[PDB]
Design a protein around this ligand. Structure first.
Ligand code: Q0I
Ligand code: Q0I
Lengths: 301, 305
């Protein structure tokens, strides 16, 4: 029993973290086989902050300009190329600790673990969700760029995120491992702002099912609702609308607890209307939205 | 910016997790050098847990009864002994992935990372605090026994907890790596209950400092208080009393933010007597008490391991 926000064990990812230095900028790189992946902004100078031409900056670089350090060993850069906003540094040594891995692009609402690093050294691991506005609410300081987000599929590491920037509101933006940003963000110092964040409704419902599995039933009610009426109410509380895909995904939890999805939706509508009234659900006074239906099944089984 | 509940990177500990099987019971073991540590209740089955004489049960067991598996490799048990509630299985192979380590006993309020495992395989890592009632509010299923709690300082792993049991309220109990339980618990199937839990006051104060470092200042007020006045109020809300040791430990955060400890105590006293008023602190509607002052400095300054 018990329900915790749990990250994946980070060992497989720690053995891939290296330090990448280019001029006066130092950040983290992900060393997989003979390639080190890192944010392309590691090549930016003091004048290319607002309008960098990364293709123009990278052409002017040589392999000897990139300092890559894996622990106490300096790796030799033998090639460099750019794929979108990620720089790929070909090195002369394959990482012997390279786990089984894949690069995945995730959707909003998906969760993942972040191994926060500084100077190529892992400092902490936490759990995140890709917000509906495509930002992540991380904990990153200067020098955390190149830290990665991942999930672990049995023995396989699925890399889904690489950290690039902090927006003015303190939220974070980054790319998948092919260098494509999540959201309408650019690796430029131009005025950028995240859209208004909304609650991941499907994840709140999954967490209410986790609470019922763990014995917490006080918020249940005898009502049901149509999907359209639930969406109309939920959108007024800045909750994401729930699609038929989300209803189907909650099916196994609905079958496990004996509470239909639309019955649980009526509990959620009531919670939004009344608040908690001094009560907590799974030790929380707010509705938690960073547990997916898959996370709930995995942790409760 | 940002403030998350963050665990230590678990790699150094994952390389020590093995599976220990004795009869029909399978749980986790911690393989350090040529010794595998695990809960001694692995030698129990059905009648054994009701009234166990662990010394009598262990004497009857042979080395070959213990099946130890490290990944896809079976380790051979060449000796066995018991230290309190932990079983130590001497193996014929030293763990090549043994990190620099020490066994430490922690105090209530102290936090640590838990590497939750099943069948010797790490499945998740989470951060928690040793509650004042000596339980931990973990997330553990059957087969999680033997999972360990740890901290990392520099490149040194300090093992502070080993999981043994779940109490009827869903909270968890375990021992240090010398087999001594945290709290008034015993490793026997008998009626046991945790004492009433209290809030780790020094940790709430550290988390309020983390909130200020991150820009959340709505709860700050012009007032200060005495340690005596604060403790009298706090103890009525089931908060742990704050000692001069706790005030000194918060010193660096008080210097960094310009909010003296007793100044922050006055904010906390108002937060208890008046509530949040619909507001949140670091995205939370409750006061968080599972971040120590050291955790806050570490996360808000980027110390690496
Ligand atoms: C490697 C850190 C870094 O680059 N951070 C930024 O957000 C940059 C600051 C200047 O503006 C900017 C524009 C575009 C891009 Cl892609 C990056 C930046 C950064 C990332 N995470 C956390 C941070 C905390 C404090 C300062 C900078 C941070
Ligand atoms: C390794 C699992 C286990 O032993 N768990 C227990 O709590 C035992 C259940 C029977 O009573 C008992 C008495 C004393 C001791 Cl030391 C252990 C037990 C166990 C541990 N964590 C989570 C669990 C979840 C569900 C069942 C059993 C759990």
């Amino acid at each position: 029993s018990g329900f915790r926000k749990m990250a994946f064990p980070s060992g497989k990812v720690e053995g891939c973290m290296v330090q990448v230095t280019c001029g006066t900028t130092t950040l983290n790189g992900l060393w997989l086989d003979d390639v080190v992946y890192c944010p392309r902004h590691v090549i930016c100078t003091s004048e290319d902050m607002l309008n960098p031409n990364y293709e123009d900056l990278l052409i002017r670089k040589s392999n000897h300009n990139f300092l890559v350090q894996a622990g106490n060993v300096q790796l030799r850069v033998i090639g460099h190329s750019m794929q979108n906003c990620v720089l790929k540094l070909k090195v002369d040594t394959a990482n012997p600790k390279t786990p089984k891995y894949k690069f995945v692009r995730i959707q909003p609402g998906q969760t993942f673990s972040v191994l926060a690093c500084y100077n190529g050294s892992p400092s902490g691991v936490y759990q995140c969700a890709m917000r509906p506005n495509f930002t992540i609410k991380g904990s990153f300081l200067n020098g955390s760029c190149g830290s990665v987000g991942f999930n672990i599929d049995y023995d396989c590491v699925s890399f889904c995120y690489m950290h690039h920037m902090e927006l003015p509101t303190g939220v974070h933006a980054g790319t998948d491992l092919e260098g494509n940003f999540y959201g309408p963000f650019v690796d430029r110092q131009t005025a950028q702002a995240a859209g208004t964040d909304t609650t991941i409704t499907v994840n709140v419902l999954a967490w209410l099912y986790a609470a019922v599995i763990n014995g917490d039933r006080w918020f249940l009610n005898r009502f049901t609702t149509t999907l359209n009426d639930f969406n109309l109410v939920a959108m007024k509380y800045n909750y994401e609308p729930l699609t038929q895909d989300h209803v189907d995904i909650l099916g196994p939890l609905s079958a496990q607890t004996g509470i239909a999805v639309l019955d649980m939706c009526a509990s959620l509508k009531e919670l939004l209307q009344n608040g908690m009234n001094g009560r907590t659900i799974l030790g929380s006074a707010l509705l938690e939205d960073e547990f997916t239906p898959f996370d709930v099944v995995r942790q409760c089984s």
